[PDB]
Design a protein around this nucleic acid. Structure first.
Lengths: 516, 735, 99, 249
RNA sequence: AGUAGAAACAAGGCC
RNA sequence: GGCCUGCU
């Protein structure tokens, strides 16, 4: 038998219309191809082609790269789902573990530990919402917390009443009703969804200080790691010792506290959204630490009210309202709290040598939102620990490949070697390996917190320029074909995100300090 | 003092700490709404990069098509799709000369495969655009629907069970006056010749999500089922060809890519003497897919298949012939909002041809105005170039031809170049006695690339001295450096099931320790964090804790019931015995000797109602879409336990007019289960033949009853009962 | 890329003084090697080892591209080849002999 | 008896009768994969989202007659509402743990005989002897190596006939294995697994894994042996080497 | 309002 | 008010 695959009919005519411009049939084109032999045709067209088609190499020197321009506009605002630098903790000193316990009872017990409650009043308005709604929501939360305190056994999860206050605060019945085009065509206002470049905003100095204090040590251990199989190999012992060193370095770090806060908050929010889709739910922000003395402790930052969460797509938004205690007066950096409503709820007395301070104690209240993807990715914030400590362990291994011996202990104790991890007005400041660990952990945590497309684009297009600059510093005669194009590609990612703008400022500082 | 991590690069080289520059710990960007805008923008951009071509109107589809081939040579560095037929034919000829026997051999193996390939091979594919319903559906479903429609219309050659016969039927369908399709809202609708042609030549456009590394979103395309067989054969030929080319890196993995990159850099630099300078270009190609004309792929394949049986040439040429006339569906549509009346609306994309432009903004208004002339029956003709890397391997072949065209035998000059090409990305090592020689070599390479419709992205490319470069997120600095930030997203619970997730997590940790140079202490930390997240996700806590969950009661009673609690699986609330030495052992086997026999038997019980196995392909294979790469499959070691359940399905089909698909699913699955019970090898080896179900089932009932009496439980009473029941079903099938 | 040349060594009295200087082509410093031993940390730029603290001062002129080591009240135990470095890059060392 | 009886019951109803009559054997695979269920793009997100629901997993109908509808306190274990496109019913994860504390028990003595590869790995590691860790730069060079340490010198297709004749002796067809190595393998794995009742498909899959040779490209430094490659993560690192000798040697 | 960012969510459909 | 769905 002979296999027959014949092109005929319409499919043949299509073959006659898929040839070069000056061919009439597939038969003729195939005959030409079979009869074709190389006779120096690339050279002829290369000679005839215009010489303006070139890839001239522009030398890259120390004076070539210019600082990246940052956008100008109103200062950048806060985007986090919870307070990071201005958080306050009410504690009970209980022996329970992280997941162990019941949320509502722990929150009520922690809140009863504080005395000095005052009738709440407006301090700094939202500037775009209805602050009285926030005030009434706070008082409602307090009242219903007492209502739970009265009854027999604290419920594991509580549902709140759907008053107009939280109906507005949670954005209920505000989605436009879906209709058919044939019924709405004469409406003049009918147009596309607003699709334009985000608003431009200039960097502010608050994000820098927030990152600075996100890398600082603390008086608690915010990581209680799980169990592993007992180490049997010497390499396993080395790994365990290294891991213990890093845990001692990073556990007492605000980055770990932020990691735990985000993980717990997002886990609770996702579980409540998946379970109580319809009805508004109360969730106290809880985080459990261990003191220097070793006594376990619980901490209550505030409360989250989750709203209707009928989330179908990964981008669908669940709205909630977050309330958090703090002592930082919002009258000093108002531009950082554009979307917050801040009340005055009490006074706190912390033991200090200056008599006793008797500071005010405010409540930051805001309406925020998330999505299934955002919740899932925020509940995997513990991989920031991985990223950071993998980088540090790569450093240690690379250095130990030079000296034939493990170099961890002297790195962590002697602290002789230091890396540039920041710049002071005096100059570049270097810190021990532990400070590098904390700095990288904070960088990863902020990447996970302020994640956005701007961050990805800037990261890629700035890694390109970083590689070029590294090649320059290595004396490898780097060259570029269109550096202005790369600069324009980098500068289009900087729009309004505080984190990416801070990264761009850091990159400019690195260029200024480099190229010398 | 202000902390600044970037300053760390002043002491640690950039590549030794490049992992810090990968923000892969946050949510990747996602698209929210329609992808119609991106589709229209891509169509217009592809058509305007070839504006100087010549216009024609297809006599079959009636759509306007633009042919830029052999068009005017470019006079600027902007992207251009004006590829020259003679130049590319000469490049392929030189490729053949440098590698004699490549095309003939590759065609021989491809001919073998094509003439022995089966239809079922088309089911092994992800979403495909079913034209019977004008929507994306699983490959198997679309194939079944198309086969049903063909059989209803009279095209039954595919009953031979051969993919070549299926393609013969597909082509024969092109010459039919009137086909018939089914729609549910069942209604039988008639499609004329032109409508069916456009439905078979069209592509479905969507928006790509979870794409890290760029601020703007892109659009991707999915073809139909009529054209996927030709694409399969063409890609088989291209893969067989590239496997014989060491300059290609597309048909290999990552480690092979690194090995070939190291080999080529060492070859180029080492052979270079002290007088010759060497430079590496880390090049990316701008608008790679939009500038590759299918007609040029037709030319390349017809040159490859010279002196071959004409049927082979025809079957391999059908694919580019259809791509040259390919159409693209605009997309989902556009959603409008009216705040004055507080409402929203969703207009399908098919109305873009006639809908007024008052609702659209300036950018979208202009895009629609520019794309309207190409709109034919709600879809836009996209002849000039490929949409999204459907011919990856042929593009790699063209790039490898360009790379080989500078072997110093065709350059005819002191300078020369080599390197590695993987579609849309390349590393080019060019050597020349002086900087002028390097400049001339790179200029000529760029010029030759522009003669083949390939453009080099000057903004994303840079040249330095050899020894430092990048290639597909692999940073080479006197040796490849591990990143570990590309695999970070794969350190969580995969989402298959409990046992599968555990095994996949431990295996991923192991692999990233082997390949991506993950440290021991870091690996231990990853194991701890993964175990924590696993327990918190599946509500399976240690059991000795007081963490109240929806599953903490049964777990606690199982804990208190067990005597040797060290053998309990983490899924059942037991301790974790994993460590760096135990990352290559399944959990069940690591705890086998510690389990109590009662719990061991209850766990690994074949009669459990949870374990379900469908086919040999889906036993222990998990499809994990890696970050910054195409979808990939992994073999994970796991023991079939009661924890190997499969999760719930979507269940939203119940509210759609396509609700009868579930009844058909149930009936097909019942019949398949009956056949499997009749033919146990149905899953492991897919049955072949031309008979129908009931014939085989009844006849095997005859024989098995017979022989199982000749020794077994059956009795004469039962054997005769089965024989006459077989006769009963026979007469039932008669009527 | 970085080359380093030390100057200012020689024969000196005990209780004498000596100014080492290292010209370069980054943090800098000074290490020393006695005939019977490997490397000993002296100074880095500031930090000084126990055996030389208060006696010796490290300084640098970034405009001259030079790092200096001002040694005072020298002991016979300071007798070593003093090597300058940059950070991977090491000088050839300058002989200091105290007696 | 039963099998032909549900066959007749299926043929009783017109739609299934038509499906059985017009559908040919070759199309078996197609219709078996015919489904409306799309393959998940983000499995982790939905696994973390579905497990927060009640009745998130699926199980055969038989579960309704082995496990009670509710446990001691009344937490529901299974529901009678079937899945989307199957006769299986959606059930809660507790029904898993319940099955592991009061479900039927069997004799799992033969699982070690089936899952030969994994238990051989465990035995090899249990008797291994570690050594000192030496810190020095390792020149990892990339090489093609065989990962499976129990491959019987057979390819996929070469051992597929052996596997069928071991598990499905009647569907072998024309093939009768010529090589005597295959003869002995068939004899051994036939007499060893003569009454094992795990599943034909899993038995075939594990026999394929054990006998079929598989190869992959990996960065290695030393070793190169099959037994030394499975522990390549534990013996070789970036700057450290851990001497190891599996229990086999 | 809010989330978010080149288009969307701020429940959908069926009676 | 009653009931259905949450990648179709």
């Amino acid at each position: 038998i002979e296999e027959r695959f014949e092109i005929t009919g319409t499919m043949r005519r299509l073959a006659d219309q898929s040839l070069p411009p000056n061919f009439s049939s597939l038969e003729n084109f195939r005959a030409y191809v079979d009869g074709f032999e190389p006779n120096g045709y690339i050279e002829g067209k290369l000679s005839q082609m215009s010489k303006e088609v070139n890839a001239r190499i522009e030398p890259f020197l120390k004076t070539t790269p210019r600082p990246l321009r940052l956008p100008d506009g109103p200062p950048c605002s806060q985007r986090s789902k919870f307070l990071l630098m201005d958080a306050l903790k009410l504690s009970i000193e209980d022996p329970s573990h992280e997941g162990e316990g019941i949320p509502l009872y722990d929150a009520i017990k922690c809140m009863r530990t504080f005395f000095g409650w005052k009738e709440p009043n407006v301090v700094k308005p939202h500037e775009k919402g209805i602050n009285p709604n926030y005030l009434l929501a706070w008082k409602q939360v307090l009242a219903e917390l007492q209502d739970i305190e009265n009854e027999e056994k604290i419920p594991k999860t509580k549902n709140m009443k759907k008053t107009s206050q939280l109906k507005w605060a949670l954005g209920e019945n505000m989605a436009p009703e879906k209709v058919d085009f044939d019924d709405c065509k004469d409406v003049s206002d009918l147009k596309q969804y607003d699709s334009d470049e985000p608003e431009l905003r200039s960097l502010a100095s608050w994000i820098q200080s927030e990152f600075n204090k996100a890398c600082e040590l603390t008086d608690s251990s915010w990581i209680e790691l799980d169990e592993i199989g007992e180490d049997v190999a010497p390499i396993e012992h080395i790994a365990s010792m290294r891991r213990n060193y890093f845990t001692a370095e990073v556990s007492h770090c605000r980055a770990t506290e932020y990691i735990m806060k985000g993980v717990y908050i997002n886990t609770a929010l996702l579980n409540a959204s998946c379970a109580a889709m319809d009805d508004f739910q109360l969730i106290p922000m809880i985080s459990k630490c261990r003191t220097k003395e070793g006594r376990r402790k619980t901490n209550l930052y505030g409360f989250i009210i989750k709203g209707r969460s009928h989330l179908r797509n990964d981008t669908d938004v669940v709205n909630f309202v977050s309330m958090e205690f703090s002592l930082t007066d919002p009258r000093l950096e108002p531009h950082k709290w554009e979307k917050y409503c801040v009340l005055e709820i009490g006074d706190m007395l912390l033991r200090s040598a200056i008599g006793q301070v008797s500071r005010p104690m405010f409540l930051y209240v805001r309406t925020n939102g998330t999505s299934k993807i955002k919740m899932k990715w925020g509940m995997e914030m513990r991989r920031c620990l991985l990223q950071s400590l993998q980088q540090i362990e790569s450093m240690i291994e690379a250095e130990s490949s030079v000296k034939e011996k493990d170099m961890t202990k002297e790195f962590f104790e002697n602290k002789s070697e230091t890396w540039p991890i920041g710049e002071s007005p005096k100059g570049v400041e270097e810190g021990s390996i532990g400070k590098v660990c904390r700095t990288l952990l904070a960088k990863s945590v902020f990447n996970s917190l302020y994640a956005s497309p701007q961050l990805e684009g800037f990261s890629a297009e700035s890694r390109k320029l970083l590689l070029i600059v590294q090649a320059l510093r290595d004396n490898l005669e780097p060259g570029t074909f269109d550096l202005g194009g790369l600069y324009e590609a980098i500068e289009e990612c900087l729009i309004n995100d505080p984190w990416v703008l801070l990264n761009a400022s850091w990159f400019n500082s690195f260029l200024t300090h480099a190229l010398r | 003092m202000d902390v600044n991590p970037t300053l760390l690069f002043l002491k640690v080289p950039a590549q030794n700490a490049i992992s810090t520059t990968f923000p892969y710990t946050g949510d990747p960007p996602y698209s929210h709404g329609t992808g119609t805008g991106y589709t229209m923008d891509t169509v217009n951009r592809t058509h305007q990069y070839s504006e100087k071509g010549r216009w024609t109107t297809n006599t079959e589809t009636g759509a306007p098509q633009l042919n830029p081939i052999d068009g005017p040579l470019p006079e600027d560095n902007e992207p251009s799709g004006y590829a020259q037929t003679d130049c590319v034919l000469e490049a392929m000829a030189f490729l053949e000369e440098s590698h004699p026997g490549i095309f003939e051999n590759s065609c021989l193996e491809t001919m073998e495969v094509v003439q022995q390939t089966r239809v079922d091979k088309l089911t092994q594919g992800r979403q495909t655009y079913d034209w019977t319903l004008n929507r994306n559906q699983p490959a198997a479903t679309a194939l079944a629907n198309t086969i049903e429609v063909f059989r209803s219309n009279g095209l039954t050659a595919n009953e031979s069970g051969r993919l070549i016969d299926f393609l013969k039927d597909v082509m024969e369908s092109m010459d039919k006056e009137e086909m018939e399709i089914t729609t549910h809202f069942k209604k039988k609708q008639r499609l004329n010749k032109r409508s069916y042609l456009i439905r078979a030549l069209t592509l479905n456009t969507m928006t790509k999500d979870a794409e890290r590394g760029k601020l703007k979103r892109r659009a991707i395309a999915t073809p139909g089922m009529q054209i996927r067989g030709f694409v399969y054969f063409v890609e088989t030929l291209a893969r067989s060809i590239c496997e014989k080319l060491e300059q290609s890196g597309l048909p290999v993995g990552g480690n092979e890519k690194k090995a070939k990159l190291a080999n080529v850099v060492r070859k180029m630099m080492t052979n270079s003497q002290d007088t010759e300078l060497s430079f590496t270009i880390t090049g990316d190609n701008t608008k790679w897919n939009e500038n590759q004309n299918p007609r040029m792929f037709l030319a390349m394949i017809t040159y490859i298949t010279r002196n071959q049986p004409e049927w082979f040439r025809n079957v391999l040429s059908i694919a580019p012939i259809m791509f040259s006339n390919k159409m693209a569906r605009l997309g989902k549509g556009y959603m409008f909002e009216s705040k004055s009346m507080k409402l929203r609306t969703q207009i399908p994309a098919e109305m873009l041809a006639s809908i007024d432009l008052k609702y659209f903004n300036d950018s979208t208004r202009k895009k629609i105005e520019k794309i309207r002339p190409l709109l034919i029956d709600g879809t836009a003709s996209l002849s000039p170039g490929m949409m999204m890397g459907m011919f990856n391997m042929l593009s790699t072949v063209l790039g490898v031809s360009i790379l080989n065209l500078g072997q110093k035998r065709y350059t005819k000059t002191t300078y020369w170049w080599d390197g590695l090409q993987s579609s849309d990305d390349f590393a080019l090592i060019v050597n020349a006695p002086n900087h002028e020689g390097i400049q001339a070599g790179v200029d000529r390479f760029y010029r030759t690339c522009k003669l083949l419709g390939i453009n080099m992205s000057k903004k994303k490319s840079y040249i330095n001295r050899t020894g430092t470069f990048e290639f597909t997120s692999f940073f080479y600095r006197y040796g490849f450096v591990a990143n570990f930030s590309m695999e970070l997203p794969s350190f969580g619970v995969s989402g298959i099931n409990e046992s599968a997730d555990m095994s996949i997590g431990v295996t991923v940790i192991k692999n990233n320790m082997i390949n991506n140079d993950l440290g021991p202490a870091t690996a231990q930390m990853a194991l701890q964090l993964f175990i924590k997240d696993y327990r918190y996700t599946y509500r399976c806590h240690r059991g000795d804790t007081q963490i109240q969950t929806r599953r903490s009661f049964e777990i606690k009673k199982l804990w208190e019931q067990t005597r040797s609690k060290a053998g309990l699986l983490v899924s059942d609330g037991g301790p974790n015995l994993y460590n760096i030495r135990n990352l290559h052992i399944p959990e069940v086997c690591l705890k086998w000797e510690l389990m109590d026999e009662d719990y061991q038997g209850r766990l690994c019980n074949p009669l459990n109602p949870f374990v379900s196995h469908k086919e040999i392909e889906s036993v222990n294979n998990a499809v994990m879409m890696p970050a910054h790469g195409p979808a990939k499959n992994m073999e994970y070691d796991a023991v079939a336990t009661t924890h190997s359940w499969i999760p719930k399905r979507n269940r939203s089909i119940l509210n759609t007019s396509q609700r009868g698909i579930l009844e058909d699913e149930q009936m097909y699955q019942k019949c398949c289960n009956l056949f499997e019970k009749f033919f146990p090898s149905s899953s492991y080896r897919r049955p072949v033949g031309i008979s129908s179900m009931v014939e085989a089932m009844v006849s095997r009932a005859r024989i098995d009853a017979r022989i199982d009496f000749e020794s077994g439980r059956i009795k004469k009473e039962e054997f005769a009962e089965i024989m006459k029941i077989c006769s009963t079903i026979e007469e039932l099938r008669r009527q | 890329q970085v080359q380093l040349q030390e100057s200012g060594g020689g024969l000196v009295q005990p209780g004498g003084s000596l100014r080492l200087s290292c010209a370069a082509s980054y943090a800098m410093g000074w290490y020393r090697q006695v005939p019977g031993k490997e490397r000993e940390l002296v100074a880095t730029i500031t930090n000084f080892a126990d055996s030389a603290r208060g006696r010796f001062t490290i300084s640098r002129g970034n405009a001259k591209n030079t790092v200096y080591l001002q040694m005072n009240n020298l002991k016979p135990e300071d007798t070593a080849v003093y090597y300058c470095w940059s950070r991977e890059t090491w000088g050839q060392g300058t002989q200091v002999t105290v007696s | 008896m039963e099998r032909i009886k549900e066959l007749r019951d299926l043929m009783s109803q017109s739609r299934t009768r038509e499906i059985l009559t017009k559908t040919t054997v070759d199309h078996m695979a197609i219709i078996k994969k015919y489904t409306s269920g799309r393959q998940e793009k983000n499995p982790a997100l939905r696994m973390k989202w579905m497990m927060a629901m009640k009745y998130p997993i699926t199980a055969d109908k038989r579960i309704m007659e082995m496990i009670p509808e509710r446990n001691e306190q009344g937490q529901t274990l299974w529901s009678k509402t079937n899945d989307a496109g199957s006769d299986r019913v959606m059930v809660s994860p507790l029904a898993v743990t319940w099955w592991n504390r009061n479900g039927p028990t069997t004799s799992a003595v033969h699982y070690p005989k089936i899952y030969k590869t994994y238990f051989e790995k465990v035995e090899r590691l249990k008797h291994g002897t570690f050594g000192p860790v030496h810190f020095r730069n390792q020149v990892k060079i990339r090489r093609r190596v065989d990962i499976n340490p129990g491959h019987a010198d057979l390819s996929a297709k070469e051992a597929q006939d052996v596997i069928m004749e071991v598990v499905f002796p009647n569907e072998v067809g024309a093939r009768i294995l010529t090589s005597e190595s295959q003869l002995t393998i068939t004899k051994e794995k036939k007499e060893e697994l003569q009454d094992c009742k795990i599943s034909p498909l899993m038995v075939a899959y594990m026999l394929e894994r054990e006998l079929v040779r598989k190869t992959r490209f990996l960065p290695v430094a030393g070793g190169t042996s099959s037994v030394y490659i499975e522990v390549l993560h534990l013996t070789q690192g970036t700057c450290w080497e851990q001497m190891y000798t599996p229990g086999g040697e």
